[PDB]
């Protein structure tokens, strides 16, 4: 069955702290609705924890605490967790984006300093029920890189991330192997080739391994569901994320494998902001998407929750002012609170 | 004394490694003039290695073992550090820019985690003489730094500083104090107030603390002496960096507290690379200054040194192509080389 079915998405007590900032910007320009939204997101409004280093295995005990907090003040939690720390990370940068590389023991140093301690906390947390996305856009770069530094650490990568999952197999912890988003491996010539790379994966991970599922739209901005894509999915059976979602589980059935999906829906770009699907860092003009939900209305994907903290850049790209990856970026926290889903308020 | 007299600045293996993408560039183009340039920066040319977060603890350790590896066959190394990684780091920006924060515990975490096991690992090697920059541009953002978040930070920053100088008091290390560049702090109005911070800064560290001095320039692009200096510094008394110098050592003279100065000359900016002088990304044009010696012409100035690795990208900023901080960027080594320094052949 579903993991979310009846449980809430536990709330990131770090992004909450940091959207506090954004709140108080609102407030310093008389902007009460904008500054009680911000307040609804820092509250109600469950977001995935990024364990994107070895020194943020720390959050992982906070995520925890929390999640034992909630549930003694009477909720049902369950805790999004992002395992992303591969060697060589991102390959089509060039370099790895992370701490990590396969030319510095890269592979052995994942699998020691950084999959077990995160495993081993997870483990003694038998109270505690996880969501764990597996290295967001890691199969994205294997389908589709073509060069040197990619094809290296292909095949390293493939086996860090069955070692990841072989270390995650447990009743209270849920994977979901990440897959990208529609625009980069929904095209129809891309899709089967995901699925294999998924298969080759899980063979690695080990006979008995399992996943519930899959992740898409991590840190991207498609909508889950519209009868009006823009204009640059002209030609894929994948626009939306819902159809993307439904096309890679009908090519996974096929080949026996799970078919399940987590949609993240942290940001929603508007009509227009972009000229190319490919565009991905601090995206403008974009807002808040729909909150965490299990009513999706669509039987392979298993919830619509927030995966990016909106307000994180990307990167010293995209919107001006924005500063390097993961640092605080708060005028685009200020957008997104403006074209804030209707739900939040 | 002077602690580089008749020593070599370390070569830093890391970047002489990532150097060698660069020597592959220039030879797959047919120009083996500035492949060899290259190869004379890879192994002799000494760069200071960068202690950035808890994780490149483990970098202290491998400048340990290639200096005990270099004195071996017969040479007399002194190994650079940088200690970089103070709560609220580089507070103008109004968000730590490395991973400890005040408000997680940050002042503890660097003493516990960072700076303890920084000196404990120095004080086993007393064998091997170590010069270590301690947190670059901290005093610039406590003299200047008026924003909120900054005036929140400075109480608990000055301890910090200050617990690390305590900590690593040893015949065998040899602490240099970042003073920011001439740029920042050198003007009148900010050389006393400059002078001031250090002297509160030394105070903390306790009654019988020592420090050999500071350290300028790093990561700029200011030359160490010209008679025909960027007009941008017109009206400034220090308008190089050996001017710098002497007006920091004039100033401190005067109070009874340190005045030697090691400058970093890793990249200098070329005519008309900048039209304000807080320009900092990824400057263009720049070349490789002169490489480390103790022939520095001014009594205040211990040594000319690399700290910042040139190559290392500033962020994503500056000049086409450029990655996040700290990611190669081998256009921009190319650059450097054929800028470089008549020394470099």
Chains 1, 2 share one sequence.
């Not at 389908?143 to 991330?161: K, Y």
């Not at 823009?230 to 059935?253: F, Q, V």
């Amino acid at each position: 069955g579903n993991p979310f079915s009846g449980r809430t998405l536990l709330v990131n007590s770090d992004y909450s702290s940091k959207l506090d900032q954004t709140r108080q910007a609102f407030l310093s320009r008389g902007d009460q609705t904008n500054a009680a939204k911000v307040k609804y997101v820092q509250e109600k409004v469950g977001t995935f924890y990024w364990i994107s280093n070895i020194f943020l295995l720390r959050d992982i005990d906070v995520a925890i605490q929390n999640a034992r907090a909630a549930k003694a003040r009477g909720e049902n939690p369950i805790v999004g967790l992002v395992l992303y720390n591969l060697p060589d990370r991102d390959c089509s940068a060039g370099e790895s984006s992370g701490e990590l590389k396969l030319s510095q023991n890269g592979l052995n140093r994942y699998k020691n300093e950084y999959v077990n301690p995160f495993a081993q906390k997870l483990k003694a947390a038998s109270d505690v029920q996880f969501a764990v996305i597996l290295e967001p856009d890691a199969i994205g770069n294997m389908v589709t890189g073509t060069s040197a530094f990619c094809r290296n650490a292909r095949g390293p990568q493939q086996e860090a991330i069955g070692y990841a999952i072989s270390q995650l197999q447990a009743s209270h912890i849920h994977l979901y192997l990440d897959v990208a988003n529609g625009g980069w491996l929904g095209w129809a010539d891309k899709l089967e080739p995901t699925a294999q790379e998924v298969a080759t994966i899980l063979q690695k991970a080990g006979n008995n391994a399992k996943i519930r599922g899959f992740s898409s739209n991590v840190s991207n901005y498609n909508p889950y569901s519209t009868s009006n894509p823009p204009p640059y999915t002209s030609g894929s059976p994948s626009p939306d994320e819902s159809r993307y979602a439904t096309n890679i589980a009908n090519a996974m059935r096929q080949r026996g494998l799970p078919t399940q999906f987590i949609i993240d829906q942290s940001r929603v770009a508007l009509s227009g902001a972009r000229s190319e699907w490919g565009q991905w860092c601090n995206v403008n003009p974009a807002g808040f998407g729909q909150p965490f939900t299990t009513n999706t209305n669509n039987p392979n994907v298993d919830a619509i929750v927030w995966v990016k903290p909106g307000g994180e850049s990307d990167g010293q790209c995209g919107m001006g002012g924005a500063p390097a990856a993961g640092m605080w970026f708060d005028a685009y926290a200020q957008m997104l609170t403006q074209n804030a889903h209707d739900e939040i308020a």
